[PDB]
């Protein structure tokens, strides 16, 4: 491109709308705020979720549950992703992290049976679903709980 012939991509940039700049622009005078009221005042408006005094929805609804301090979440992996590897390959949490499939392993890798596996593999992971273990082993592979 040439500095004297620049052209942005169509629709990439828009013109800011300025209010209170004459009537014919469509936002003159009231600047789109309407006529009087609380919402027409500078800094006006009510806090989010406010209902003008009617009991708000969250107040109506009860609190529920608790958070387990020892909660454990696992980074999930499916058989379709495992298909990306070659037969005889040793699948490991390190292997997954290097491949970029699992950037954050959380409490560990758990393998699920969402897809159809087609390659023989020795898979090492924190956990395996029962269906996932069966699929891996039926494909001639093996599973080891790291």
């Amino acid at each position: 491109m040439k500095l004297h012939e620049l052209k942005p991509a169509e629709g990439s940039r828009q013109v800011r709308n300025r209010v209170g700049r004459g009537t014919s622009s469509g936002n003159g005078k009231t600047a789109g705020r309407g006529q009087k009221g609380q919402k027409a005042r500078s800094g006006g408006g009510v806090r989010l979720g406010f209902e003008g005094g009617q009991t708000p929805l969250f107040r109506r609804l009860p609190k529920r549950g608790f958070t387990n301090i020892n909660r454990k979440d696992y980074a999930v992996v499916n058989l379709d992703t495992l298909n990306r590897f070659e037969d005889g390959t040793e699948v490991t949490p390190v292997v997954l992290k290097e491949a970029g499939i699992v950037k954050n392993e959380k409490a560990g890798i758990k393998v699920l049976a969402d897809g159809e596996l087609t390659k023989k593999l020795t898979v090492k992971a924190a956990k395996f679903s029962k269906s996932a273990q069966e699929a891996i082993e039926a494909a001639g592979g093996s599973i080891e709980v790291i």
């Binding site: 989010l48 929805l57 969250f58 609804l61 009860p62 609190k63 529920r64």
Partner: protein, 64 residues
């Protein structure tokens, strides 16, 4: 600053897979003698935040 979450809502609702919010039911605290067993049974079940209510409050749970 970071937009803050409404902690009361965070305690009362759950984000579902499809983006909706799961909520408990009202009238499930006491005075059960005033409600038929059908009412109690059908209030035991959870429900979803209605469209109007969600459109009012979604910004308070953006980062829930």
């Amino acid at each position: 600053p970071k937009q803050k979450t409404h902690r009361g809502l965070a305690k009362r609702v759950k984000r579902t897979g499809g983006g909706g919010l799961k909520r408990g039911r009202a009238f499930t605290s006491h005075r059960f003698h005033g409600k038929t067993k059908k009412q109690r049974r059908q209030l035991r079940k959870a429900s979803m935040v209605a469209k109007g209510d969600y459109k009012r409050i979604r910004q308070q749970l953006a980062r829930m």
